[model samples]
Target: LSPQLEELITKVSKAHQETFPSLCQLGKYTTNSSADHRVQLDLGLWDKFSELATKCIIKIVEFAKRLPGFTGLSIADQITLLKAACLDILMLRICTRYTPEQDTMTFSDGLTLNRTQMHNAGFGPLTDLVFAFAGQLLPLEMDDTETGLLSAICLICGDRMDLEEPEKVDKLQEPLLEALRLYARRRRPSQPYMFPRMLMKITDLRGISTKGAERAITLKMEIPGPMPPLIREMLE
Candidate 1:
């Protein structure tokens, strides 16, 4: 209802778009990386997947830096929040681009991979779970604004451990919660429950992120070399 809230929504939407490409915006291309079954490791897919994942982490940092009031937090708090929520946002971003018909997901540069390819590309046991989550997202029919606001809500959470100012982070998150509710309601007068459903996705996101971190553990042993620095920080 307030101009400030409107501005907040606009900024969040723009930040997400700038950092994460929507599915239609991408020129999705497929990979021949063994669309068969889960393997111990596929070196080629591993290299490409890790590289793209690192790029996404940088973009997530950029998106965070752009969020209003994010820079106001102590440097330590900022890093803490980033490390805590980076994987969550990454999972949400990829899930948003899911193509259920083809059972594929697209990356920022339009790298589309099928479920098996996703498994081969290092998702391993986590691939089907992620795809199921993406499928669940279909009925929500979230637009970019909703997706952006949800992502911001995910990143600015106060519950992350070791934050220097959890209350400060919570303060920043409050308006985002409000903006999403209002924007979602105004967008769908018929669907009053959409806002809460979207919020629930945050819980689901966190669950997947936890599994993703575990996946990274065994994944490290399979890869030829070290995890990318940003990814290592995120998984930590």
Candidate 2:
């Protein structure tokens, strides 16, 4: 891995360990049946996880912004790329908290949440947001092939498979792939590396769903309707 990529991995791993302590002990297939699902960690640990993830995401975005030809693109194209890829980027953020051993991922607050908890927390709504973002990018007149490729890019980046349920990731793959290809063809790149480089990062985009689940909780606490304002803020 390049120094930058290695740095990112180190930063994310540290954040993951500090945020989810129970996760540090569990083996790859470990399971927990605890009530409340919250692991106890020091305040310092909590702060590290919370801050590091944000920093990592900002770094990712900064890297995107600095791509050789990115600034040369039209404003509309730049916006399109951002909208199309934002969820995938966010998914990367979510996966950073994943733990394969315990078969669970905990939030920044050390809350160990399962798939059901994740569903209840807000992935349902976030998934919808992803789809909506895809929809906005879909009408750009990209061909079938490009749409397929781009959606694949998004799904791979999201990598929901690590969260104890591969089926959820499996189910999202088709549509996301379709969306990406369509977007790709429509956006016909003058700089081919940009899209592909972003696509390639999908594999490196591993982690769990602590941040994703936490989003659900935060939205539930704050928003009144099916959609949450905070999520909308992210998209905007």
Candidate 3:
């Protein structure tokens, strides 16, 4: 691997680790939002969830800014890319913290919620889909570096709607992709397919993020007030 690629990997990994919390690092705690199958929106849970999600959005913005060459893009393009990819990164972040044995997801502050509580807390129908995606992720066993690189690839993507410098964005993404490919392969010499498998999760993340955006729409109606500022900005 090129020294430059190695540096990119280190930068991406450090940026992610700095912005997002790891499962092992958190003191996972659970909530008592009814575990029953009867799905109901818990306003209290929504309040907490919205608060945590808002903080996560800010972290994502920080993460984007830290990416090499990201700030060189026009301010307009920066906001554009952030708005488009915030949900994808948020979804990916939470899912990475999934605790399969407990059937729960832990947020940045270590707030752990079960499947039923996740349903109650604004996820509603999106709960099962996300958990299933998390379960699939378990098999891949991606470490922080891979997850960080993939998130960079997801956010720095060129195809997001209205970018003033799509070519520049694509240029930024190339090194991230190369970094991930080389790093994933080198980290696991026997598993040549891991890099491709990790890339495929981006497609999966987009699918869930689209659904997550839709969930936000319905959730706005259910909640007592308007969505939180950063959360609203991301959905819009």
Candidate 4:
């Protein structure tokens, strides 16, 4: 990698690691006044998870703003990209914290949720597939550097609908893709295709996010109460 490319990667990686909690780090502890199945709607859990997810959304925006060329883009395009890619980033973020032997994923502040609790919290039918995706990701053995780069790529995507400056976004993504290839090979020269595999994952992430949107729709109708305001912003 050129000096400039390496510098860019480090800048992006630092923003990602510092702004978002690592899978290995513990989050601040919280509860929904936290009761369970005795109630039809676990408002306590829902409230807490929604709040956590909302906080995550803010952090992701912070992460995006720190990306080298991100803040230079038009505000509309910046918002467009975040709206398109936020859930994808959120899924990847939590899925990285998956503890396979335990079969659970931890959210921000070290809040761990089993599949059953995840279902009750709002995932419902989408729970199983999410767990499956996490299981699949485990084999990739991606470290924080790779994870952070991949996340930046997801956010900088040019293909998201309704971009005022798709070309500009695409230009920004080219270097990131190159940076990842350089970084990935340096990390594992033996796995030449890891970069390609990671790119393929963008497609898979889209599928998962689409289903997540559908699940969000189903959830809005089913839940007794309205979703958290930020959660609704994400859903819309």
User: Quick one: best TM-score, which candidate?
Assistant: 1
Per-residue alpha-carbon lDDT of candidate 1 for residues 1-236, written as tens digits (9 for 90 to 100): 59999999999999999999889989988877787767777889888988999999999999999999999999999999999888888999999999989989998989998888899888889988999999999999999989989989988989888988999999999999999999999999999999999999989998999998899999888887899888888877
TM-score, per-candidate, Cα-based = 0.98, 0.34, 0.97, 0.92
lDDT of 3 by residue, 48-135 (tens): 9899998989899999999999999999999999999889888889999999999989998999888898998878888899999999
State in Å the error of residue 76, model 1. 0.7
* Candidate 1 vs 4: which has more lDDT: 1
Off by over 4 Å in 1: none
**Ranking 2 against 3 by TM-score, winner:** 3
Candidate with more favorable, higher TM-score: 1 or 4: 1
> Listing every candidate in turn, what is its Cα RMSD in Å to the true structure after a full C-alpha superposition?
0.9, 15.1, 1.1, 2.3
Stretches > 4 Å off in candidate 4: 27-41
| Top-lDDT candidate index | 1
Q: Write the per-residue lDDT of candidate 2 for residues 1-236, one digit (tens) a residue.
A: 14543343333334333333333454433123322333322233333334534554454445444433444544554444444455455564344445444434554445554543344333544433433333333234333233224323442222322233334334434444444433444466564444554455454332223344555455545434333333333344
* lDDT by residue for model 4 (1-236), tens: 39999998899889888977776677634344423443333655676678889899999999999998999899999998999898999888888888887666788778887666777787777878988988888888988888889999999989978999999999999999999999999989999989998888888888889999998887778667787776677777
Alpha-carbon error at 44 in model 1, in Å? 0.3
User: Number of clashing residue pairs in every model?
Assistant: 0, 20, 0, 3
Q: Of the pair 3 and 4, which is ahead by TM-score?
A: 3
